[PDB]
């Protein structure tokens, strides 16, 4: 088990802890804080009017590309124990006189918004006054943890049921709740990048 070392470098945690005050205002040592930073997944998500549309119907073609961290890192792991703050900005041409009152609700994951009594906690924000919507859906499942993406989720967790009254285009972002981490560690996926037609 002979393991050697080159360069007789000084204390590595003497140069970097010094060579961030020269190069990096921030000094990152954890990784979980990424899940507290909202970076977007979609940029249009053109919605429809007076149709409560769940979010799982969106975030299923979201955890398949890694356009954020909450997905790119998913593969590394399998489980999670927290809530997913979903922030929704508006870009719709609301140069009109109507009153948009985009409304959010709570629905169990993998329910289709048609078999639901839409009551309970909610939220209503007006884009004409505040072009955001910054809910903090908590973790109200009944299990210690949850597989990242399986097909047996007939209510093992909570979700959004985003409601609106107008035909809208939204920007979106999602990081995770103050108690949102992942479970086991596993290996890595395969990545594709740039493509060159010919």
């Amino acid at each position: 088990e002979n393991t050697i070392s080159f360069f007789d470098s000084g204390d590595p945690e003497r140069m970097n802890n010094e060579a961030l005050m020269r190069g990096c205002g921030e000094q990152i040592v954890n990784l979980r804080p990424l899940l507290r930073t909202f970076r977007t997944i979609n940029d249009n998500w053109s919605l429809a009017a007076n149709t409560k549309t769940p979010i799982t119907d969106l975030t299923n073609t979201a955890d398949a590309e890694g356009r954020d961290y909450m997905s790119y890192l998913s593969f590394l792991y399998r489980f999670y124990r927290g809530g997913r703050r979903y922030k929704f900005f508006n870009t719709t041409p609301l140069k009109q006189s109507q009153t948009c009152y985009v409304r959010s609700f709570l629905i169990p994951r993998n329910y289709t918004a048609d078999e639901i009594n839409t009551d309970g906690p909610s939220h209503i924000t007006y884009p004409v006054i505040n072009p955001v919507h910054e809910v903090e859906v908590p973790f109200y499942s009944q299990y210690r943890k949850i597989p990242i993406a399986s097909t047996s989720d007939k209510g093992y967790d909570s979700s959004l049921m985003y409601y609106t009254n107008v035909g809208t285009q939204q920007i979106v972002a999602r990081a995770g709740n103050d108690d949102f981490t992942f479970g086991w560690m596993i290996g890595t996926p395969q990545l594709q990048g740039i493509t060159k037609e010919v």
Partner: peptide
């Protein structure tokens, strides 16, 4: 030295809180 004061105390922020 601020963030270098928290990284050394291992405060509950860096770990994701």
């Amino acid at each position: 030295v601020k963030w270098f004061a928290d990284i050394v105390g291992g405060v509950a922020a860096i770990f994701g809180w």
